[PDB]
């Protein structure tokens, strides 16, 4: 809401000229006080008019009117309201703003440290998966590509935080640099790429399960394309739409319809994934239960529950829980739940599919024995 400060200096320059008429009782015409300007004043009567629109924001009263005069000593009455020459209602809920900014800072620190821990785990996990030749396989290739996607998302998060909030707020309000737009574009690209790789991971296991007789080698390029190029295409489309229509400085605002261009596919990339996940669960069920005859297979649904629990972070289906919510509990629930889980998802996936993997641990112990 920086598009109101300009009129202050516009009106200052407009009425900065010397008085042209001094025939009044006090001689007041065409100078600018702190808020408003008066062309000519009749000392016989005083009028009441609406206050400047700058204070329309954060105002619960609409159409308020105050009495304004020309006198240099007082533009308005002695005690019209809280502040003399301003609108009737100027300031309210002082502690609410402080508590809100404190909560926002706390959640900012929380998701930043979560993303940092996830990034620290993901670099070493990707190094382990890539350096070792034995683990080279299509599943590990999808696993390492998803790790790179998470790493890029965390790096974009850090760059956007550095280039948006670490910089001076007044400087950002005054002007938005091209680096801000580039950082925002990279951020959106990385977020959408990470979401599209959670879908690819779900689609790969689905294709593996439903279609046993499938050749992954000749379809790997298609998976890479759908995981990388489509987010790139959508990001470029959003960028050119913002450049052509409704630039308005830094592209942090989402109140425009163009935000749907980013919001549309991402939600879809979740929903289909969830559906696939559900199908995969069913695919497991018939095999997890006694296949042929009744045995003492105690707690098979418990095994299904633990499999679901370990599959939650790989698929990222938890996002569908509060993704459909338009405005229900958005600050204290959707943002808090989705930033914490998004920041820790990379770390959980890395510790669940790399450190706790049986084959990876079995190879790592023998490598440690070889080196010592």
């Amino acid at each position: 809401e920086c598009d109101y400060v300009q009129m202050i200096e516009v009106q200052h320059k407009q009425c900065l000229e010397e008085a042209q008429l001094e025939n009044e009782t006090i001689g007041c015409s065409k100078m600018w006080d702190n808020l408003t300007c008066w062309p000519a004043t009749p000392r016989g009567q005083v009028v009441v008019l609406a206050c400047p629109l700058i204070f329309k924001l954060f105002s619960s009263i609409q159409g308020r009117n105050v009495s304004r005069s020309c006198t240099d000593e007082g533009w308005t009455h002695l005690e019209p309201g809280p502040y003399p020459i301003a609108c009737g209602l100027d300031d309210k809920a002082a502690s609410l703003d402080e508590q809100q900014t404190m909560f926002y800072g706390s959640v900012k620190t929380g998701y930043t440290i979560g993303y940092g821990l996830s990034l620290a785990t993901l670099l070493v996990a990707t190094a382990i998966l890539s350096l070792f030749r034995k683990l080279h396989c299509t599943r590990n290739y999808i696993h390492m590509h998803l790790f790179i996607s998470f790493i890029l998302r965390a790096a974009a998060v850090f760059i956007k935080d550095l280039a948006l909030f670490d910089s001076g707020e007044s400087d950002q309000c005054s002007e938005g640099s091209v680096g801000c737009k580039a950082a925002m574009v990279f951020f959106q690209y990385c977020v959408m790429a990470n979401f599209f790789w959670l879908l690819v991971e779900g689609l790969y296991l689905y294709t593996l399960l439903a279609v046993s007789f499938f050749s992954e080698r000749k379809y790997f390029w298609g998976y890479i394309l759908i995981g990388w190029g489509v987010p790139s295409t959508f990001t470029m489309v959003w960028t050119i739409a913002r450049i052509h229509f409704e630039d308005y400085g830094c592209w942090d605002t989402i109140n425009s319809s163009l935000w749907w261009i980013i919001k549309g596919p991402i939600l879809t990339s979740i929903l289909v994934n969830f559906i696939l996940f559900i199908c995969i669960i069913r695919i497991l069920l018939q095999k997890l239960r006694p296949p042929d005859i009744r045995k003492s297979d105690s707690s098979p649904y418990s095994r299904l529950a633990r499999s679901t629990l370990l599959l939650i972070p790989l698929f990222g289906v938890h996002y569908i829980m509060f993704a459909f919510f338009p405005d229900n509990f958005k600050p204290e629930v959707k943002m808090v739940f989705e930033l914490v889980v998004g920041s820790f998802q990379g770390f959980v996936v890395a510790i669940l599919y790399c450190f706790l993997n049986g084959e990876v641990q079995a190879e790592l112990r023998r490598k440690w024995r070889r080196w010592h």
């Binding site: 954060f58 900014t101 948006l164 707020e169 989705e338 930033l339």
Partner: peptide, 28 residues
């Protein structure tokens, strides 16, 4: 996503704080 809405809310809050501080600084 949550990141974009959080960023928009935080930048609106920062702009609001800047505007309120600018108005309150010039008490006149």
């Amino acid at each position: 996503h949550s990141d974009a809405v959080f960023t928009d809310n935080y930048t609106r809050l920062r702009k609001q704080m800047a505007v309120k501080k600018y108005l309150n600084s010039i008490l006149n």
